Design an enzyme around this catalytic site. Structure first.
Site, short mmCIF file in Angstrom:
data_model
loop_
_atom_site.label_atom_id
_atom_site.label_comp_id
_atom_site.label_asym_id
_atom_site.label_seq_id
_atom_site.Cartn_x
_atom_site.Cartn_y
_atom_site.Cartn_z
N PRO B 34 0.81 -1.27 0.00
CA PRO B 34 0.00 0.00 0.00
C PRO B 34 0.84 1.32 0.00
CG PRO B 34 -0.65 -1.49 1.84
CD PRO B 34 0.66 -2.02 1.27
N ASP B 35 0.21 2.50 -0.17
CA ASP B 35 0.93 3.84 -0.12
C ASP B 35 0.97 4.56 1.30
OD1 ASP B 35 2.11 6.46 -0.84
OD2 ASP B 35 1.46 6.20 -2.90
N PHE B 36 0.58 5.85 1.36
CA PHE B 36 0.89 6.71 2.52
C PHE B 36 -0.04 7.93 2.50
CE2 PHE B 36 4.85 7.93 5.34
CZ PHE B 36 4.05 8.61 6.25
N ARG B 37 -1.18 7.79 3.18
CA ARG B 37 -1.94 8.91 3.76
C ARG B 37 -1.92 10.20 2.92
NH1 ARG B 37 -3.40 4.60 7.08
NH2 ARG B 37 -2.03 4.36 8.90
N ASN B 97 11.76 4.35 -1.70
CA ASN B 97 11.03 3.23 -1.07
C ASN B 97 11.99 2.53 -0.13
OD1 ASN B 97 9.55 2.33 -4.26
ND2 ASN B 97 9.12 3.88 -2.84
N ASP B 99 11.20 -0.89 0.62
CA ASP B 99 10.79 -2.30 0.47
C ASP B 99 11.95 -3.15 -0.04
OD1 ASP B 99 10.82 -1.88 -2.37
OD2 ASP B 99 8.89 -0.80 -2.03
N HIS B 116 16.08 6.61 1.47
CA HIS B 116 15.44 6.55 2.79
C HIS B 116 15.94 5.35 3.57
CE1 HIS B 116 11.90 9.34 1.56
NE2 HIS B 116 12.93 10.01 1.99
N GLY B 187 6.69 6.70 -10.83
CA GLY B 187 5.92 6.44 -9.63
C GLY B 187 6.14 7.32 -8.42
N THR B 188 6.40 8.60 -8.63
CA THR B 188 6.50 9.56 -7.55
C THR B 188 6.28 10.93 -8.17
OG1 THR B 188 8.04 10.65 -5.99
CG2 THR B 188 9.00 9.59 -7.91
N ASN B 212 3.93 8.27 -14.56
CA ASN B 212 3.28 8.49 -13.30
C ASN B 212 1.77 8.62 -13.47
OD1 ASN B 212 3.90 8.77 -10.46
ND2 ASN B 212 3.08 10.87 -10.70
O1 LIG Z 1 7.93 5.17 -0.73
C1 LIG Z 1 7.67 4.17 0.18
C2 LIG Z 1 7.87 2.85 -0.18
C3 LIG Z 1 7.65 1.81 0.69
O2 LIG Z 1 7.89 0.61 0.14
C4 LIG Z 1 7.14 2.07 1.99
C5 LIG Z 1 6.94 3.41 2.40
C6 LIG Z 1 6.45 3.79 3.65
C7 LIG Z 1 5.36 2.92 4.30
C8 LIG Z 1 4.67 3.27 5.47
C9 LIG Z 1 3.92 2.25 6.11
C10 LIG Z 1 3.16 2.50 7.26
C11 LIG Z 1 3.12 3.80 7.79
BR1 LIG Z 1 2.03 4.09 9.42
C12 LIG Z 1 3.86 4.83 7.16
C13 LIG Z 1 4.62 4.57 5.99
C14 LIG Z 1 7.20 4.44 1.48
#
Ligand SMILES: Oc1cc(O)cc(/C=C/c2ccc(Br)cc2)c1
Ligand SMILES: [Zn+2]
Lengths: 4, 261
Positions: B34-37, B97, B99, B116, B187-188, B212
């Site tokens: 999944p993504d981010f809020r 990312n 991951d 990151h 993708g960003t 994108n």
């Molecule tokens: O660009 C990316 C790629 C990735 O694979 C993971 C994340 C961050 C994930 C995440 C999960 C749970 C909470 Br709560 C906050 C952030 C960002």
């Protein structure tokens, strides 16, 4: 300088 | 004004030889990430805040357990980037990312800037001793907080948290961006600094190609004349590019060999  | 096919042809001819790539979460949601809020967090960003983490490291370690290898596999976008590497075209891949799928797809670490950070290594929060990531896997995988065998400090995977310096390898941007002959953004949006203005750091003769969901960020804000946007499903855009490149067969070869398809 560069910080998240 | 350039089209996707023009870029494809510049690559087919080696007019583009030194490709600099920047990626974000949009390449990982097709792998089912999944993504981010409900992680037990006062607010989302707390999972990558150091004070919160010192007061409660469990939510972060829950994420780590979910992202450790074996839960997700790379998808066609990762494999297209591997193909760039294999064809002698990849100068550097900058990823936001965590991951680890770029490495998993077999891009060598020397080609990657994991801006990151990474779960592949960890660091004592207290005495700064480094440790390989597998050393704490047992503990994370059993829901124990890993502790420093010397000072007892919590040992944290080398994910970059808010307020921390980007990794030292991020300094490669000083040389990679002037050297790039093609910038690929997948993708960003690159809304956060510093990633946003790195899109400005290539020379204006350098095509900037965005694949994108939408047109957003500094390519929207400060368009240059050799910019190309390929909007829509990222996977579909990549597969279109692959097809204009004539790399369909090589893609199938590579996906089958790495994933058993
Ligand atoms: O660009 C990316 C790629 C990735 O694979 C993971 C994340 C961050 C994930 C995440 C999960 C749970 C909470 Br709560 C906050 C952030 C960002
Ligand atoms: Zn320690």
């Amino acid at each position: 300088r560069h910080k998240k | 004004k350039l089209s996707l096919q023009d870029v494809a042809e510049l690559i087919r001819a080696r007019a583009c030889q030194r490709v600099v790539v920047m990626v974000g979460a949009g390449i990982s949601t097709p792998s089912g990430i999944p993504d981010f809020r409900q992680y037990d967090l006062p607010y989302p960003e707390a999972i990558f805040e150091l004070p919160f983490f010192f007061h409660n490291p469990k939510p972060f370690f829950t994420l780590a357990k979910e992202l450790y290898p074996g839960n997700y596999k790379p998808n066609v976008t990762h494999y297209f980037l591997r193909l760039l590497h294999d064809k002698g075209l990849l100068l550097r891949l900058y990823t936001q990312n965590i991951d680890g799928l770029e490495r998993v797809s077999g891009i060598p670490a020397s080609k990657l800037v994991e801006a990151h950070g990474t779960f592949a290594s960890a660091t004592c929060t207290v005495c700064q001793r480094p440790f390989p990531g597998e050393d704490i896997r047992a503990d994370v995988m059993a829901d124990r907080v890993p502790r420093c065998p010397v000072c007892t400090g919590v040992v944290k995977p080398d994910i970059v948290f808010f307020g921390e310096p980007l990794p030292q390898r991020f300094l490669l941007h000083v040389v990679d961006f002037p050297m790039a002959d093609l910038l690929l953004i997948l993708g960003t949006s690159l809304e956060v600094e510093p990633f946003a203005s790195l899109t400005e750091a290539v020379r204006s003769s350098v095509p900037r190609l965005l694949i994108n969901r939408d047109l957003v960020g500094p390519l929207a804000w400060h368009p240059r004349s050799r910019d190309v946007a390929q909007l829509g499903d990222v996977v579909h855009g990549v597969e279109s590019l692959v097809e204009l490149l004539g790399w369909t067969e090589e893609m199938r070869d590579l996906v089958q060999r790495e994933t058993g398809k």
